[PDB]
Amino acid sequence: AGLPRRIIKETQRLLAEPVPGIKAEPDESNARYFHVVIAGPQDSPFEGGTFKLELFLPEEYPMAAPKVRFMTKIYHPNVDKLGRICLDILKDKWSPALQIRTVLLSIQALLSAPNPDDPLANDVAEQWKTNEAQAIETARAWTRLYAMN
Amino acid sequence: MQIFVKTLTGKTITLEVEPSDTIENVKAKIQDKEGIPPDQQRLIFAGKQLEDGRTLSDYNIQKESTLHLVLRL
Amino acid sequence: GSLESPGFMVHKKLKSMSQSYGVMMTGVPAEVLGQMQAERSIPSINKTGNLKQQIAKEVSKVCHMMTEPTQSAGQASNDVCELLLGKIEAEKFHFTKYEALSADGDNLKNVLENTAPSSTNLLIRFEIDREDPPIVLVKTKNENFNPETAVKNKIYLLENKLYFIDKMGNLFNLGPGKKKCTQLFNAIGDSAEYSLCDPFVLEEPEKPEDFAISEIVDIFNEQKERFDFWIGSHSFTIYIPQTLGESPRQFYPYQAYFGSHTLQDWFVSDKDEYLSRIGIDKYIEKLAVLGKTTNTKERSDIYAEFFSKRGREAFFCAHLNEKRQPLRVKFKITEINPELALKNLQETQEFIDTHPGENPSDKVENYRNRAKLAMTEHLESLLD
What we know:
The structure holds three protein chains of three kinds. By secondary structure, chain A is an alpha+beta fold. Chain A is 33% helix and 15% strand.
């Protein structure tokens, strides 16, 4: 049939029990795309905002990692100019032992705790590391502008 | 064959390698010579980031080439 | 209010200078750094384009790679060793062999209990390895399989053999006879590469292919001991200065961590002092658990508590960063001559003082601007 049984099972398990604070539903055109909405973590500079993301499962999943990008503008040191995020695996690599849900929880965690020293946006990460308070306030401002509707 | 690895601090390291050696085997040679675990290092040749699985011939690294050890992600 | 020991003064000076001066602690002139980075960056420049603008684009992009201190945990341990030992004794220390930390860490503790706290200054260097087993199974015809050219770190299923080629190229027959291999070869489909760590096939097998891959994973697990999957992963040091009188022995951990922080960030965060407060016995005990546990959460928690950037312990080894493979802790120990270490630190401070500027920030900025100007100039020279 259409999609490999692992993608079908992961999709149904995600829908049956969502990740708290994360809506994740497959696209109806192509079930390898997921529309994701992550709520700004409590006590983080993105608190209050809702952030939309696209999650794509390449043909070689699960041997290739998913591809995730933000569809909502965000002032984050680990999101790049096109909204893409790196999955941030230090001193290890992606493997089929990992799942879509682990990816979703990791994105939620990187909202809750940016990592300036593994940056995709060098300028944002620099401003995050020298003037942390300034970058936090900028993040709150962009949450106001683009993430609260 | 013999290759060189340079650091930002000016240091040059000499390694005996074969062309079928992977980039990971090269990193382990650097570890044996400098005490830097393979995970804490990247390699560069001709401005390209090398991947652990690929081989020296996969990148056309020939004798006496100079790679650069990168110690910041 | 007596004076601290010379050995403790090494720690205080190393910590203070590293906080203040950062990248300057290497003692390498800024010009060297800029020229080396120019040599790294010259391929990225298109020689038919705008040369001035490509150079300024490259210089402003790779600035941090140049003027920030290293994140390599290995390079940080090397820096510490060279400050405290000097070049010659640090080379001798490096060719000393690593010992494995025992299951409860009593071999390290025993070394520590046979040196009097008042008599010596100890430097311990640790290396953590992680298991990196093969994850791919390749089903191939015998006629297409030549062990000399096959990709390394894979398991190979032929019509009549089951082989593992490790990271270094060693060929291991895994042991099943020809009929078993015929069974496995023909139970599996035609995709060529299959996963050995896919939980949906290993835990929810639904077709014979899943059961065959599962049998292969079991055959491999049952003889894991024949192989060496270890790859060097983390590095750090612990300094134990002499005490005076009946004062109890303190230890201080130093590290950098790739993609996470520098030795300078480590000192600025005082995580060295924080971990110091738990005591060397507790520290060694949890190191030993780390190297011995089979539980992923326990492994991840100890690793995060000990090696994370301060303030990130809750996320450092979570989710995608869970520590799902066994770890191995190794150590080597040497004595420190505190006089020599203090001389290396003072010589580094003399180097730092040759830089114009009033406060440490100003000398650091001199150093960085010099590196950027030397890189711009060396690129201009390489492009003629």
